[PDB]
Design a protein around this motif. Structure first.
Motif, PDB file in Angstrom:
ATOM      1  N   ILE B 189       1.002  -1.076   0.008  1.00 29.75           N
ATOM      2  CA  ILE B 189       0.067   0.038   0.011  1.00 29.75           C
ATOM      3  C   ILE B 189       1.057   1.238   0.010  1.00 29.75           C
ATOM      4  CG2 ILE B 189      -1.848   1.132   1.236  1.00 29.75           C
ATOM      5  CD1 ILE B 189      -2.820  -1.319   2.350  1.00 29.75           C
ATOM      6  N   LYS B 190       1.347   1.561  -1.240  1.00 30.40           N
ATOM      7  CA  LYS B 190       2.350   2.775  -1.271  1.00 30.40           C
ATOM      8  C   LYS B 190       1.941   4.118  -0.864  1.00 30.40           C
ATOM      9  CE  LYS B 190       0.712   5.569  -4.989  1.00 30.40           C
ATOM     10  NZ  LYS B 190       1.155   6.958  -5.271  1.00 30.40           N
ATOM     11  N   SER B 191       0.568   4.218  -0.538  1.00 27.17           N
ATOM     12  CA  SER B 191       0.147   5.569   0.002  1.00 27.17           C
ATOM     13  C   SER B 191      -1.075   5.667   0.758  1.00 27.17           C
ATOM     14  CB  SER B 191      -0.125   6.620  -1.296  1.00 27.17           C
ATOM     15  OG  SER B 191      -1.138   6.276  -2.245  1.00 27.17           O
ATOM     16  N   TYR B 192      -1.102   6.506   1.570  1.00 29.62           N
ATOM     17  CA  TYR B 192      -2.238   6.716   2.490  1.00 29.62           C
ATOM     18  C   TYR B 192      -2.785   8.285   1.996  1.00 29.62           C
ATOM     19  CZ  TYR B 192      -0.402   3.021   5.521  1.00 29.62           C
ATOM     20  OH  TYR B 192       0.119   1.803   5.925  1.00 29.62           O
ATOM     21  N   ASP B 193      -3.807   8.036   1.309  1.00 27.81           N
ATOM     22  CA  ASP B 193      -4.402   9.416   0.700  1.00 27.81           C
ATOM     23  C   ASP B 193      -5.542  10.034   1.431  1.00 27.81           C
ATOM     24  OD1 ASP B 193      -5.526  11.355  -1.209  1.00 27.81           O
ATOM     25  OD2 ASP B 193      -4.793   9.978  -3.014  1.00 27.81           O
ATOM     26  N   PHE B 194      -5.410  11.251   1.940  1.00 25.06           N
ATOM     27  CA  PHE B 194      -6.257  11.715   2.792  1.00 25.06           C
ATOM     28  C   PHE B 194      -7.387  12.698   2.040  1.00 25.06           C
ATOM     29  CE2 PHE B 194      -3.061  10.820   5.805  1.00 25.06           C
ATOM     30  CZ  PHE B 194      -4.061  10.583   6.940  1.00 25.06           C
ATOM     31  N   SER B 195      -7.064  12.808   0.687  1.00 28.78           N
ATOM     32  CA  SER B 195      -8.013  13.668  -0.247  1.00 28.78           C
ATOM     33  C   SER B 195      -8.166  15.406   0.257  1.00 28.78           C
ATOM     34  CB  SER B 195      -9.150  13.006  -0.340  1.00 28.78           C
ATOM     35  OG  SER B 195      -9.026  11.690  -0.739  1.00 28.78           O
ATOM     36  N   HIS B 196      -7.385  15.708   1.221  1.00 26.86           N
ATOM     37  CA  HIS B 196      -7.609  17.077   1.621  1.00 26.86           C
ATOM     38  C   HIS B 196      -8.807  17.327   2.791  1.00 26.86           C
ATOM     39  CE1 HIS B 196      -5.227  17.929  -1.994  1.00 26.86           C
ATOM     40  NE2 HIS B 196      -6.307  17.399  -2.712  1.00 26.86           N
ATOM     41  N   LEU B 197      -9.149  15.974   3.288  1.00 25.70           N
ATOM     42  CA  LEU B 197     -10.320  15.944   4.140  1.00 25.70           C
ATOM     43  C   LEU B 197     -10.158  16.556   5.756  1.00 25.70           C
ATOM     44  CD1 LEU B 197     -12.008  12.790   2.992  1.00 25.70           C
ATOM     45  CD2 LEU B 197     -12.797  15.077   2.459  1.00 25.70           C
ATOM     46  N   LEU B 198      -8.532  16.425   5.990  1.00 27.60           N
ATOM     47  CA  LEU B 198      -8.436  16.752   7.473  1.00 27.60           C
ATOM     48  C   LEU B 198      -7.220  17.899   7.545  1.00 27.60           C
ATOM     49  CD1 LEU B 198      -7.552  13.354   8.580  1.00 27.60           C
ATOM     50  CD2 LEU B 198      -9.699  14.334   8.713  1.00 27.60           C
ATOM     51  N   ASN B 199      -7.468  18.931   8.318  1.00 29.12           N
ATOM     52  CA  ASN B 199      -6.672  19.862   8.737  1.00 29.12           C
ATOM     53  C   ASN B 199      -5.337  19.188   8.876  1.00 29.12           C
ATOM     54  OD1 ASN B 199      -6.276  19.271  11.672  1.00 29.12           O
ATOM     55  ND2 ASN B 199      -8.360  20.253  11.674  1.00 29.12           N
ATOM     56  N   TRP B 200      -4.097  19.853   8.784  1.00 33.53           N
ATOM     57  CA  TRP B 200      -2.763  18.968   8.929  1.00 33.53           C
ATOM     58  C   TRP B 200      -2.466  18.598  10.267  1.00 33.53           C
ATOM     59  CZ3 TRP B 200       1.274  19.843  12.289  1.00 33.53           C
ATOM     60  CH2 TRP B 200       1.403  21.208  12.790  1.00 33.53           C
ATOM     61  N   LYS B 201      -2.843  18.962  11.388  1.00 34.89           N
ATOM     62  CA  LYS B 201      -2.875  18.331  12.684  1.00 34.89           C
ATOM     63  C   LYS B 201      -3.428  17.051  12.963  1.00 34.89           C
ATOM     64  CE  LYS B 201      -2.452  20.477  16.517  1.00 34.89           C
ATOM     65  NZ  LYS B 201      -2.527  21.141  17.733  1.00 34.89           N
TER      66      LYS B 201
END
Lengths: 374, 374
Positions: B189-201
């Protein structure tokens, strides 16, 4: 379709001063017989050592032999791998990569029966405005002679010049004053070029006094020591006019982009390693919303033709450029030299496949020299 | 040699879910008769309005009519002039510019009897490693179904996947745990994609718990809100793994480059306006010494083929990419679809002039729809 051999022939063309600059005319041969031509110029710069052409031919062939000239990205990566960038303006490896990459462009274009122009994204214009050089005055006595140059060149169509300053500031103002009162708006000095000779604060002082003369001034060129990014930035904020600097390596360009150190990126294929690398540099500048201008080189018609095609393909060149290499020599090694008219450098005939410039074997033998020794 | 007409035909291809995404198949005609084909995909994204294709054809023709398709730089500047960049991921103007520029590439290549590949700098490789998507789990119940997807796709050659996370973190660890104990090193699983859904913290917290599972993890994708450059930068310093983000505009890319906000630039022609713009973005990243990967799109074989050629021409792609648009649909509108084998996307046959993908008129009529309305 496959590279089979390489020719590197050194030539020395006497300048209007008697001094002879040595260039290398490149010929890349293929199995089918088509040949791409290129030029490695500016070898007459420090460091004070010369490259062994016999050895260089061997090394370059080992890299190119059997390859598909159309694999430009692959080949350029291999060239960069063997001739690393060094953040130094006159790295000989850059001139070397330039001659090879440019010859590959000529080769590929000839093969496809198209002008190098169409291989670079087409035309945005058919010519780019350039300026004629006025080399730095060391004494106020040389002023008169330079006034004649302006006189002479203006009659020949060059209404825009670049002034190399920094040495004798009193002599520079006198010159600027003399040109203003004699030609008025007829002539323009688009740039004051410091050639990295002054620290930024000293350049700032000079800039303040010289800018009292705004004869169509467009930019201040190289007003800080080489790689002095923070200095360029400070000067950029204290100077109303655009600050311009040459691009000699991606690392250097990246630093200037990141710091927003300059306003205009001065690009020349010979100093960045060829058309392929120059396009990358121009695009990086475009992405950063920055302007580009083409710089000066000691190139003959072969090398200058490459810059003409490049310049006419870019969308972010809104100022006067500096390619006037051919003007430094009386002769050259081509059948027909690049065209300069009304202070514009014209891109070679788009209907002529390849670079649009052809070598003249007789002239090649005439200017031939055994090596690149000093 | 001269553009004479344009065709914009909307098509709707049912996804494996029944839902139908609408695309536009582009055809640029010329006076000589050659035609360039392109694809405008991803119209099924917010904003919630649809573009009038009749009007769009008219506007695009007014720009293109009578022009030389080889003037790519000139035409792209005119396209950008009329369809400005907006720093928004799904700007419809980007999809529009993409279809036109890509069709121009196909056209120019066909004219010169060369593959689009050779028009992009040649080949650095013949295929690029891609990954299969595992869409975000909202419930821990969907885990089993996703495990089957991994099972099924692994058998089909896809040993690398990208996981869209963020919703139910407990469900994500369970999935990651289940895949690790069942396939071990067989799957990555080469990546965990957050899709801009969470603030950085919040992304940082999730990243710390999910990275407990390193199944060949290569990067963390879109871990901050759109255009949150300072957030990406903070996360970049606190995350051991490379941070990747999509490029949707030069201004956005410039900000990330200047701030050194990310590690890997995720580029897709559809989101930046076409091959020409994508090349500029890739080169700007190269000049900045940054890596690139190709992103996911809803494109069929026509659009995906463009990315295959692009990807095989770049020298700064050292990680797994995401183009799997064809996998979203059962059907398409071409004679032969792009090839995926052993988790690699192959560039179309270099011996076939143009894109290397041909339309199937019967399939075009079969999937035709009257408009791009929701």
């Amino acid at each position: 379709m496959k590279i089979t051999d390489l020719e590197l022939h050194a030539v020395g063309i006497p300048r209007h001063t008697g001094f002879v600059n040595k260039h290398v005319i490149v010929k890349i041969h293929t199995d089918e017989g088509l040949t791409g031509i290129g030029e490695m110029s500016d070898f007459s710069h420090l460091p004070l050592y010369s490259v062994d052409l016999h050895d260089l031919k061997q090394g370059l062939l080992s890299i190119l032999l059997g390859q598909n000239p159309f694999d430009l990205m692959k080949i350029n990566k291999e060239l960069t791998d063997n001739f690393p960038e060094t953040m130094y303006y006159y790295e000989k490896g850059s001139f070397i990569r330039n001659g090879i990459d440019n010859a590959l462009h000529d080769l590929c274009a000839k093969y496809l029966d198209i002008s190098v122009s169409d291989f670079l994204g087409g035309r945005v214009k058919e010519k780019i405005k350039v300026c004629y050089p006025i080399f730095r005055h060391r004494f106020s006595e040389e002023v008169e002679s330079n006034l004649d140059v302006v006189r002479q060149k203006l009659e020949q169509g060059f209404d825009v010049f670049r002034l190399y300053v920094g040495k004798n500031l009193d002599a520079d103002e006198e010159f600027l004053s003399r040109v203003k009162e004699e030609f008025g708006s007829r002539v323009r000095i688009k740039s004051y070029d410091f050639s990295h000779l002054l620290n930024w604060k000293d350049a700032h002082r000079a800039i303040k006094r010289l800018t009292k003369y705004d004869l169509g001034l467009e930019m201040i060129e190289s007003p800080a020591p080489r790689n002095d990014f923070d200095g360029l930035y400070q000067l950029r904020l204290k100077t109303d006019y655009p600050i311009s600097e040459h691009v000699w390596s991606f690392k250097q360009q990246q630093e200037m982009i990141k710091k927003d150190a300059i306003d205009i990126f001065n690009i020349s294929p010979v100093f960045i390693g060829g058309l392929t690398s120059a396009k990358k540099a121009a695009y990086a500048a475009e992405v950063a919303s920055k302007d580009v201008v083409l710089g000066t080189t000691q190139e003959l018609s072969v090398g200058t033709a490459a810059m003409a095609h490049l310049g006419c393909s870019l969308t972010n060149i809104n100022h006067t450029s500096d390619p006037t290499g051919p003007e430094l020599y009386v002769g050259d090694v081509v059948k027909n030299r690049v065209t300069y008219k009304d202070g514009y450098l014209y891109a070679p005939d788009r209907s002529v496949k390849g670079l649009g410039i052809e070598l003249d074997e007789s002239l090649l033998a005439k200017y031939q020299v055994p090596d690149l020794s000093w």
